[PDB]
Design a protein around this ligand. Structure first.
Ligand code: A1BTZ
Ligand code: MG
Length: 278
């Protein structure tokens, strides 16, 4: 059959200069951490210690500066345009917020993305965006984000927006969270653990099983963080759609192996990230 399109997701891409670094190593997507201030406004692209093994944890930007850089990287005609960069996952570090600030945080995020990434609809960045939320109880962030885009007069940008709950919750609990949020597509399911620790495939297999069932709710599955060729082959063998990595070149090398070239290909802008692969 057709090759499954694969997102090679650069991990912890939090300084503007790292966007090119990861894309030039083969990533067609990046993951960026978003810290929030005491008012639920996005503040920095900052992960902080502890972080993945082998990585500097403290590179960061003002969030809106990063967005402007991401916009340059994803706007056709810009001198820094990277046609290959087609998906950005924002790892929303909402751990610092009270639960009743989740909706507010979504609204503030939408205002920043609209102003600095989508440029108020004037020739903005073209990448698809995943809002990745680590706590199922923060699902009201999604409605806040959508209602703010709608108030500002750009509800159509939701077409470029998808969803992830990154806490490794039980898959049934995840689906109930989406049901409470009223979400019925554009769903990515993360599964994983820091590259510092070992992990098995039980939950990622269960996520794949949900995605490929007739009435599942997951559209795409990605495994993180994968820095080794053998783990990459395992995750591809299990049928994932995305691999998050500190080393995009390692993933690329496996995908260029002859047996994997026949079954996978690097996703491009015309691969809709919200559509389950068949
Ligand atoms: N959110 C994850 C999973 O997508 C895990 O934490 P992280 O900061 O390593 O980024 C990726
Ligand atoms: Mg992260």
């Amino acid at each position: 059959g057709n090759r499954r399109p694969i997102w090679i997701m650069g991990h912890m891409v939090n300084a503007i200069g790292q966007i090119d670094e990861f894309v030039n190593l083969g990533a067609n997507s990046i993951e960026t951490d978003v810290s929030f201030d005491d008012n639920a406004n996005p503040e920095y692209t900052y992960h902080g210690i502890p972080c993945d093994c082998g990585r500097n944890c403290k590179k960061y930007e003002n969030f809106n500066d990063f967005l402007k850089g991401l916009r340059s990287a994803t706007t056709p005609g810009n001198s820094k345009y990277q046609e290959k960069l087609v998906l950005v996952v924002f790892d929303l570090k909402t751990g610092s917020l009270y639960d009743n600030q989740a909706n507010d945080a979504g609204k503030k995020l939408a205002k920043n993305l609209l102003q600095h990434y989508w440029n108020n609809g004037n020739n903005g960045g073209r990448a698809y965006i995943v809002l990745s939320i680590p706590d199922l109880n923060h699902y009201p962030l999604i409605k806040g984000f959508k209602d703010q885009l709608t108030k500002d007069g750009h509800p159509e940008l939701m077409d470029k927006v998808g969803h992830d709950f990154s806490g490794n919750d039980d898959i049934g609990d995840v689906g109930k969270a989406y049901k409470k949020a009223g979400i019925t597509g554009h769903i990515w399911q993360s599964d994983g653990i820091t590259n510092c620790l070992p992990r098995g495939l039980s939950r990622v297999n269960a996520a794949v099983a949900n995605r490929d069932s007739a009435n599942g709710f997951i559209n795409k599955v990605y495994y993180w963080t994968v820095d080794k060729r053998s783990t990459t082959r395992d995750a591809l063998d299990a049928g994932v759609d995305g691999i998050m990595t500190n080393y995009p070149d390692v993933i690329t090398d496996v995908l260029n192996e002859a047996a994997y070239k026949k079954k996978f290909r690097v996703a491009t802008y015309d691969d809709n990230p919200w559509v389950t692969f068949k």
